């Protein structure tokens, strides 16, 4: 009967002190966590953060909410969550988190006859993971989401992953634009602060960047302009207008590429592999123009000897530099 | 016992007037501040501010909340903060702040048997600090956070850093890609005005901008283009097309770099060291083109003497200008 369930619920809620956690004087309450990732909507290197969306479930035994005579698992409206005790769970590295409120506050309370309580939310977090761009765009990040209890110590509360490694789901279905989730790992620790030893859980994704964006219009055009400088070695030793225009226009193209790619890159004032590669190419075309300068000055003070030496050397030196760069950053 | 703790807490709450501070007629209540810095999210020069995230703890002794018979330190829900008096603290230099509400409004209350009250928050503030940028990107900034009391003077309240220099922690956790915190300083002030003495606390970071990115892209291309003008000296005095194309294309490249740096650097309509250096390089390439024009006019209306003079002078003048700039901005 509906009235029977109504009086049972009122009996459970009446005299319920939300402030006191379950087993206040007793041992710590064990809260089993669970996550179902819906998507990773964004991964920005500008702010070193990524947006995650997830169904976040928390299971805990609360003997005060045990009821008998109703074999069904009661599913109450979200507002009942205001009148009960829930863990003070929070994420350390979040920058701006919120619970979705589309037509209702997206929460679920599911009681059980044995006092077990399921509290689920739909949370969109903007987590912060620091990224090293030393090997960018050949990098591999380790972005993590960490979960802790803000107030209660390990003596008061206890966290664990519900179902072991199977707790977190939906990672496989994720399809990032410029990343690939190589692996996800779950960890449980106790973190000692000045106040006391708190519990912690951690969910870490190892994201490997996909190199399809960075070989076809970043390295390829710089390489080909370097080839055109090599062509500048091949023209002549007296056609001053042609060689000078070719060299300086190649320099101009490299400067244009560098400026527009820096405008394209996500504004991280730090040295990166692409930056050293492009500066190497720029220095190479600059050295080609200097080589023509030396040839012209020496003749108009052997020009053919220096031109042939440059023809032999510059391709070899650039190939050596490219091999060194590729092996160093791989 | 559940009932014993419940009735103890109920006894504490009743008879408690939140409007009245502890020892309302008595001496001022001493409040111990404490901060644990999680991270500095960003430091924006366009708005001259920085976003900080921290755990902000305040300790104060309240005899109305003292309890006996429970040797444990009671940790209650964040909602209990509604029913207790707390200091009217605020950050004087701020633009936007909030307390994280990820599944709970992030607060912790931890009553102690001797009446001591711990009030912890997790605050993501956006503090405003002045930023001189005459020496940009070689600038060295001093940003501050100014904690203060709104209504109370020293007679009613009093602030102090807890542990002295140990009050603020987590400075090592700060990872700014383009800055390095040289030091942090804590200053407690008791600023005496005619009406009364108002307390204040100041947490001041001394940031220094690393030059491993700005130097490379900002100065190496410009220096190399100036060296290409230097190449333009050595070509000839009758190869008109080659020298003219080289000089004017170097001018075009310098303009391109300047405009794209304007579009790249974060929009400070202000005179800076980088602007002075870029205009110096632009003026140098401009003078190279001008003296070639003089050479052409003299030759077609000695030319070699002017070319030798330029070869001797321009590298020396540019080295002198560079040395003066570096010594003046260091």
């Amino acid at each position, epitope marked *: 009967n509906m009235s029977f369930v109504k009086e049972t619920v009122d009996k459970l809620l009446k005299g319920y002190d939300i402030r006191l956690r379950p087993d206040f004087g007793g041992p710590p309450v064990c809260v089993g966590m669970n996550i179902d990732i819906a998507s990773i909507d964004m991964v920005s290197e500008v702010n070193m953060d990524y947006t995650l969306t997830m169904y976040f479930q928390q299971y805990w035994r609360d003997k005060r909410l045990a009821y008998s005579g109703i074999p069904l698992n009661l599913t109450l409206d979200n507002r009942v969550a205001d009148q009960l005790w829930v863990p003070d769970t929070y994420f350390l590295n979040d920058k701006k988190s919120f619970v979705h409120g589309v037509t209702v506050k997206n929460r679920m309370i599911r009681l059980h006859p044995d006092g077990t309580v399921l509290y689920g939310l739909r949370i969109t977090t903007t987590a912060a993971c620091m990224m090293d761009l030393r090997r960018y765009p050949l990098d591999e990040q380790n972005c993590t989401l960490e979960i802790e209890s803000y107030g209660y110590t390990t003596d008061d509360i206890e966290f664990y992953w519900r179902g072991g490694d199977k707790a977190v789901t939906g990672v496989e279905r994720i399809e990032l634009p410029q990343f690939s989730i190589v692996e996800h790992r779950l960890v449980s620790r106790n*973190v000692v602060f000045a106040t006391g030893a708190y519990p912690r859980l951690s969910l870490s994704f190892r994201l490997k960047r996909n190199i399809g964006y960075f070989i076809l219009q970043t390295y390829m055009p710089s390489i080909l302009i370097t080839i055109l400088s090599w062509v500048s070695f091949w023209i002549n030793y007296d056609a001053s207008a042609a060689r000078v225009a070719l060299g300086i226009t190649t320099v101009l193209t490299m400067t244009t590429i560098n400026t527009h790619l820096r405008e394209t890159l996500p504004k991280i004032p730090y040295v990166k592999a692409i930056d050293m590669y492009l500066m190497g190419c720029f220095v190479f075309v600059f050295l080609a123009l200097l080589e023509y300068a030396f040839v012209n000055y020496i003749f108009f003070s052997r020009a053919a000897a220096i031109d042939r030496w440059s023809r032999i050397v510059f391709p070899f030196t650039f190939s050596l530099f490219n091999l060194v760069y590729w092996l160093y950053y791989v | 016992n559940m009932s014993f703790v419940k009735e103890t807490v109920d006894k504490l709450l009743k008879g408690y007037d939140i409007r009245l501070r502890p020892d309302f007629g008595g001496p001022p209540v001493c409040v111990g501040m404490n901060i644990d810095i999680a991270s500095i999210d960003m430091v924006s020069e366009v708005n001259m501010d920085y976003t900080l995230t921290m755990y902000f703890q305040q300790y104060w002794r309240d005899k109305r909340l003292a309890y006996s018979g429970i040797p444990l330190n009671l940790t209650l829900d964040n909602r209990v903060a509604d029913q207790l008096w707390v200091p009217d603290t605020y950050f004087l230099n701020d633009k936007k702040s909030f307390v994280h509400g990820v599944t709970v409004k992030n607060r912790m209350i931890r009553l102690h048997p001797d009446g001591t009250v711990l009030y912890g928050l997790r605050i993501t503030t956006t503090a405003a600090c002045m930023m001189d940028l005459r020496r940009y990107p070689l600038d060295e900034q001093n940003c501050t956070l100014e904690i203060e009391s709104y209504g109370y003077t020293t007679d009613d309240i009093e602030f102090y850093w807890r542990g002295g220099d140990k009050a603020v922690t987590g400075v090592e956790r700060i990872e700014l890609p383009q800055f*390095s915190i040289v030091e942090h300083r804590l200053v407690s002030r008791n600023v005496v005005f005619a009406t009364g003495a108002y307390p204040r606390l100041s947490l001041s970071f001394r940031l220094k901008r690393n030059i491993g990115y700005f130097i490379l892209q900002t100065y190496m291309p410009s220096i190399l283009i100036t060296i290409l003008s230097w190449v333009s000296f050595w070509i000839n005095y009758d190869a008109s097309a080659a020298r003219v194309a080289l000089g004017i294309t170097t001018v075009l490249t310098m303009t391109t770099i300047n405009t794209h740096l304007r579009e790249t650097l974060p929009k400070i309509p202000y005179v800076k060291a980088i602007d002075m250096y870029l205009m110096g390089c632009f003026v140098f390439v401009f003078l190279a083109l001008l003296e070639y024009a003089f050479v052409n006019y003299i030759f077609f209306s000695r030319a070699a003497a002017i070319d030798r003079w330029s070869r001797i002078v321009f590298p020396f003048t540019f080295s002198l200008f560079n040395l003066v700039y570096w010594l003046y901005y260091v």
Partner: nanobody
Amino acid sequence: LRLSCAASGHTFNYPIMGWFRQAPGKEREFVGAISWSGGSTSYADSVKDRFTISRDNAKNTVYLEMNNLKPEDTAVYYCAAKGRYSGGLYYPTNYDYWGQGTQVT
């Protein structure tokens, strides 16, 4: 005296570096802290202005140097690494990867 500690592997995941002293009686007691990036340092009160830390990323090595030794300092030292969200610095349990004890008189 001089005592350096070189690291390897995924150093970026463990930016913070700690120097612990394990006495015969009491456990790993104080912390000489240093960040890999920026060289920001933090010392215990007892070891201020006498033990100092530097770093060099050309070989990824920190350098703790002892100055003005007293006889009570005879003990074994550990070099440990700590992550970006491991909590407080002055607690050995927050540190993950421990090194071999170096005994010094």
